[PDB]
Every structure is written in structure tokens, then in C-alpha cells.
Amino acid sequence: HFADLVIQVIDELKQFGVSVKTYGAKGDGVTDDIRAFEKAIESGFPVYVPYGTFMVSRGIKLPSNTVLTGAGKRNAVIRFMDSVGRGESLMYNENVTTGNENIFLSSFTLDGNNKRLGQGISGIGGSRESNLSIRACHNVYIRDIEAVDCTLHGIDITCGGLDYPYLGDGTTAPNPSENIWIENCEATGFGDDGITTHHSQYINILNCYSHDPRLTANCNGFEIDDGSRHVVLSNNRSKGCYGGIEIKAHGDAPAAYNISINGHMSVEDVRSYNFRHIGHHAATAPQSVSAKNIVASNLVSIRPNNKRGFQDNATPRVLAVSAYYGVVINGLTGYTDDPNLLTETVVSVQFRARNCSLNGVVLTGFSNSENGIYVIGGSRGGDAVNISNVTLNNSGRYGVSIGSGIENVSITNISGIGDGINSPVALVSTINSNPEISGLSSIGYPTVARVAGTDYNDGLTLFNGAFRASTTSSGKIHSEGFIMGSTSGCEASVSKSGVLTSSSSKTSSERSLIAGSSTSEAKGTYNTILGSLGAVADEQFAALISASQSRASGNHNLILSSYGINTTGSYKVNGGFEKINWELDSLNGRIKARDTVTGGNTWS
């Protein structure tokens, strides 16, 4: 009774808040301590969990304004008893349907004791049976928690209700969680996902470690799932999962949107980064109206593989994007030391993914994979894929491959070493005839660029649309036209028309060229105007060379070395000065001079 008096004095000091041991907890790894937790938690004081293994016969419910802190991971341990049945998460907020506010959890281990159920078992339904489930809550800070041997997830942030709602694409579920911080947490040995979000927003997941699920279904390190939005993940690590970071939805739910990945390291996952929207992948399916806005940077992928046979032996990826609009990837390094682990495609952008950008990519060691980067589109309006500053080190028989359905591709500054690849084919390959391409460099690929079946092995620069260079202003240029090295006032307004080295000169002539000229105009077809001033060619095949103030208006009518004449004859070459003065008549075989025609001349 002396020790009990001393303890009473210590308890009253409340150095940490109130200890659970003050309310009767033993933390001996045997005794049911649930009532002690419930009493401390309802007391209104911040609650402290000291050293021990605190056994619990039912889930710990958290009310609003809870502070629960432990002595640390693997120091304060909270654990389900062997006798606990099915249906409850180990720790969760009390108001399951409308939520709670202001919950601060730090520094302990949650052990779900999934072992007690035998092997091969996951959550019984919906969000039930995670180690930590946060439903419809606002202002939740989760820090330095280790979640171990979990039946469903390690840590799950979701909307109100025990079930996950499936309300269809383009919806938002009632009672989201909001303002959540998950930092320095670890999740392992889970049945589904390590750390996951559903139908919630304004979430930061920082410096966490999720690894080694028990099962081999859709078991992801970080799963930003159905209904999520406005989430930042940064400096996390995943290991040995299906997806490292998955961002998705099911077919009957809205995809996660506006998600930022500010650095991540994926170790030996199947698909390190896996962004998708089930049910919105097929050509005959609707486009997702929710799968939009992902910005990911400083992404690391190491030895992706499917040794464990996740998802019925799904093929490995460094990055897989499907369904999503507006994905921006900057700074990606994929590395492997075993060429047989991933043999299909290292990076894929397919299945209705659109308006995606990849910049600053290094892929090394994928020497038995068919494709480094493989993009397939749907001939959708306003689509684009931009791939720039990519370096491939023995990665991909096709380094960058662009398939069907892609009309707008920009591929710039790609370099590749192919010497160590098993049967390399081409650094860059394109199905469409009009990719935009520049800055290719390679060694050990038999072909550098293959564009719609034509090989380019000595450098390539391809640009699309109306073209203009070395010209500070101009009028209209047709998409099959150009103006170069010209001063103001020029136009090339029809298919196959162009102006070079001229001033104030215009062509509306299909199949035409004006060069070295001023104030000249071509307006027929098959027109040529060269080194001329105030020249007009206005009939089919009409042309002028070294002419001033002259108009060629005849069919196949050419004017040479002339000033101030207008000609109209068919198949005639003419010259003159204020009046026509000679003619070579190809039609009738006549030669005519205004003055004399003579032989026996000398030029001195």
C-alpha cells in the first residue's frame, strides 16, 4: 500500500497527461486493457501510453479532441487479443458515419494480430478491420505510428460509413475526411494496402514506409483510391508491393484527382507508379470525367518485378498510366540489375491516358524489355504526348515507341545505348507519319529513328504545321506552306506555296515558289518567281525570272530578263522592255524578234 501511495502522487503530477496505467491498464501482453483505454480517453485529458504491450478485446474508439501519445514505436504496443472476432478496426474514430474533429495520434505500434484468424484472410467488407481507420474526420495528425499484421489496411482515411460508397464516376461522396497529416508512419503485413485514402481531401503523406503485404491481390504500398483529391505524397518509400503508389478508382466511382508526388522511392514493387481508372480504359468505354491532374517528380523505381505473382502475374512497370488526363512527370530514374524481371514495357502510357508529359528520365538495365517507353492514343482532339530529355542505358529493344491513335507527339533529346540489349531494334519508333522529333543520339541500336516504316540513322529534325524562320513578321502561312529569310509583308496562303528571301511578296498559288524577290505575287498554279521586282504570275505554269514590273498570264508562259511587259501566250518564253521584244514559241515552233534575227555574230 506504500507503493500505491507513491503511484497516486505520480499519477496526480500528470507529467505526460494521463497514463492509461492510471486507469488500470497492465500492458503485460495478456490482460485485457480496453476499459482502461476507454476510461482514459473519455476523461478529457491527453492520454499517454507508456512502455508495454496493451491487449485489447475490442477496437479503441476515438472521440473528438483526442490526444493519444505513446512512448514510441515498439515501446508502446497496442494489440488485438487472440479471441477478437471480425468486423472492427483496431483503432478508429467513434462517430463512424458523420465523423470527429481534432485527433492527434503519435508514437506507438498498432498490431492487428491478423495471425489469430489463420493465414490468407483480409477485411470482411468495406473499410472494416484496418489497424487505423479514420472516417469523415477533420484535423487528424497521425505521426510515428507503426502498423503491423493488419487484416485490411495499415492506415485508411475514408468518408463516413463503414462501407465504401460506389456512386458512379463524376460524384463526390458525403462526409469526406479533411485536413489529414500522416508522417513517419510504417505499414507492413497488411491484407490490402499499407496507407490508403478514399473520398477525402487535403492530405499530406510524408516520409512513410509501406512494405510487404501478406496477400497478392491489388495490394499497394500507398493507394490513393476512389474519391480522393488534393493529396501530397512526399519522400515516402514502398517495397515489395503490387503498386508502389497507385492512384485510381474502380469503375463505379470517381478517380482520384489533383494528386502531387513530390519524390518517392519504390523498391521491388510490380508497378512502381500505377495510375488508372477501371472501366474507363477500353476504346468503347466512356472517358473518365474524374481522372485528371497528376504532377509527379523525383520518382525512383528499383528492380520492378513480379516474383510474388501479384494480380495474376501482371507484368512489371516502372510507370503505368491509363485513363488519366494531365499527367506531368519530371525527374524519373528507373534502375534494375536483373534483365529478366521486366520484359514487356518499362513505361507505358495507354488505355485512354491523354495529355501526358515525361521529362528528365533515366532508365538503366532493362536490357531484355521490348519497349522502354510505349505510348498508345485514341486519335482524340486536343491530345498531346510530350517526351523530352530521356536517356536509356540498355533499356528497351524499342527505346521510345509511339503506337496508333496518336496524332500529336513531341519527342526531343533522346539518347540511348543499345550495345548490351538482347536484339535491339530502334531508339525511336513511330506508327504515325508526322511525329515532331529532334535531338536523337544513339549507339548500338541498328536503327535510330523509324518513322512510319522509314529509317533515319544520321540525325533527324521534324516539325509540323505552317513553318516560318528568319522572318520577323508575315501574313498568313498555310499548314503545307512556309516563309523563310524574308522581311515583312509576305504570305504563302495555300497548300504547297512558299516564299524565300523576299519582301512584300505573296503567293496563293498551289505548287509555287517565290524567291529573291520584292512586291511580287503568284496566284495561278505551278508558278515560279525568282529574282524579280513587281512581278505577277497569274496563270497555270506561268513564271518570271530576272523580271521587273511584268506579268506572265499565259499557260506555261515564262518571262526572262525583262522590264514592263505583260504576256498572255501559251507555251511561250518572252522577254522585252516596255513592249514584248522576243518570243520562243514552244507551241508552234516559231522564234520572233521585234527587230532583227541574225547569225554570224561576235561579242566584241
Bind-site residues for Mg(2+)? 198, 223, 225
Could you give the angle at the alpha carbon of 250 between the alpha carbons of 228 and 379, nearest 5°?
100
Q: Which of 38, 101, 212, 480 binds a copy of itself (CB under 8 A)?
A: 480
Which is closer to a copy of itself, CB of 112 or CB of 435? 435
Cell of 248: 485510381
Residue 539 in contact with Ca ion, rule: CB under 5 A:
no
User: Which residue stretch of 222-230, 330-338, 434-442, 593-601 sits at the interface with Ca ion (rule: CB under 5 A)?
Assistant: 222-230
Could you tell me how many residues make up the chain?
604
Figure out which of the listed residues 129, 192, 225, 383 binds a copy of itself, where binding follows CB under 8 A. 383
Least distance CB 332 / a copy of itself (angstroms): 7
200 binds a copy of itself, rule: CB under 8 A: no
Q: Which of 35, 163, 309, 469 binds a copy of itself (CB under 8 A)?
A: 469
**576 touches which of Mg ion, a copy of itself, Ca ion, none (CB within 5 to 8 A by kind)?**
a copy of itself
Span 97-116, contacts to Ca ion by CB under 5 A: none
Which residues within the stretch 223-282 sit at the binding site for Ca ion (CB under 5 A)? 223
Q: Is the Cβ–Cβ distance between 66 and 45 less than 8 Å?
A: no
Q: Which residues are near Mg ion by CB under 5 A?
A: 225
CA 449, CA 247: separation in Å to the nearest integer? Answer: 33
Q: Which region among 66-74, 193-201, 347-355, 363-371 touches Ca ion (by CB under 5 A)? A: 193-201
**Window 128 to 167, contacts with a copy of itself (CB under 8 A):** none
Sequence letter at residue 456? Y
**CA of 224: how far to CAs of 135, 231, 261, in Å?**
15, 8, 11
Could you say which residues in the range 210-239 bind a copy of itself, by CB under 8 A? 230, 232, 234-235, 237, 239
Residue type at 330 in one-letter notation:
N
Contact 249, 227 (CB under 8 A): yes
Taken in order 373, 379, 383, 388, is the CA torsion positive or negative?
Answer: positive
From CA 96, how far away is CA 113, in angstroms rounded?
22
Burial class (CB in 10 A: 0-12, 13-18, 19+), 87: middle
> Using the rule CB under 8 A, is 46 a contact of a copy of itself?
yes
Shortest Å distance, C-beta 574 to a copy of itself: 9
Minimal distance, residue 313 CB to a copy of itself, in Å: 25
Q: Which of 80, 108, 190, 209 is close enough to bind a copy of itself by CB under 8 A?
A: 209
Q: Does the protein bind a copy of itself through residue 58 (CB under 8 A)?
A: no
Binding-site annotation, residues: 198, 223, 225
Selected range binding a copy of itself among 111-119, 124-132, 201-209, 248-256, rule: CB under 8 A: 201-209
Tell which residue, 315, 319, 317, has the closest CA to residue 299: 319
Largest CA distance in the chain: 145
> Which one, 225 or 521, has the nearer CB to Mg ion?
225
C-alpha cell at 563: 522590264
In whole angstroms, what is the distance from residue 510 CA to residue 247 CA? 51
Q: Which of 63, 126, 335, 339 binds a copy of itself (CB under 8 A)?
A: 335
Residue 322 or 474: the one with the smaller Cβ distance to Mg ion is 322
Only one of the segments 85-93, 147-155, 294-302, 310-318 lies at the binding site for a copy of itself (rule: CB under 8 A); that segment is 294-302
The interface region with a copy of itself, picked from 91-99, 121-129, 292-300, 341-349 by CB under 8 A, is: 292-300
Q: What angle do CA 164, 101, 237 make, to 5 degrees?
A: 60
Binding range to a copy of itself, per CB under 8 A, among 151-159, 218-226, 315-323, 408-416? 408-416
35/74 with CB nearer a copy of itself: 74
DSSP state of 518: B
* Residue linked to cell 497496442: 78
Measured CA to CA, the distance from residue 135 to residue 121 in angstroms comes to 23
3 state SS of 20: helix
Work out how close the CB of 84 gets to a copy of itself at its nearest, in angstroms, rounded to a whole number.
26
Among 192, 226, 370, 383, binds Ca ion (CB under 5 A): 192
The interface region with a copy of itself, picked from 29-37, 117-125, 280-288, 430-438 by CB under 8 A, is 430-438
What is the C-alpha separation between 403 and 416, in angstroms, rounded? 19
Q: Are 273 and 348 in contact (CB under 8 A)?
A: no
Question: Which of 32, 38, 212, 436 lies at the binding interface for a copy of itself (CB under 8 A)?
Answer: 436
Of all residues in the shown chain, the one whose CB is closest to Mg ion is: 225
Contact 538, 551 (CB under 8 A): yes
Beta strand spans in 269-308 (E): 271-277, 292-302
How many other β-carbons are positioned within 10 Å of the β-carbon of residue 5?
8
Binding a copy of itself by CB under 8 A: which of 64, 171, 503, 549? 503
Residues that bind Ca ion (CB under 5 A): 192-193, 218, 220, 223
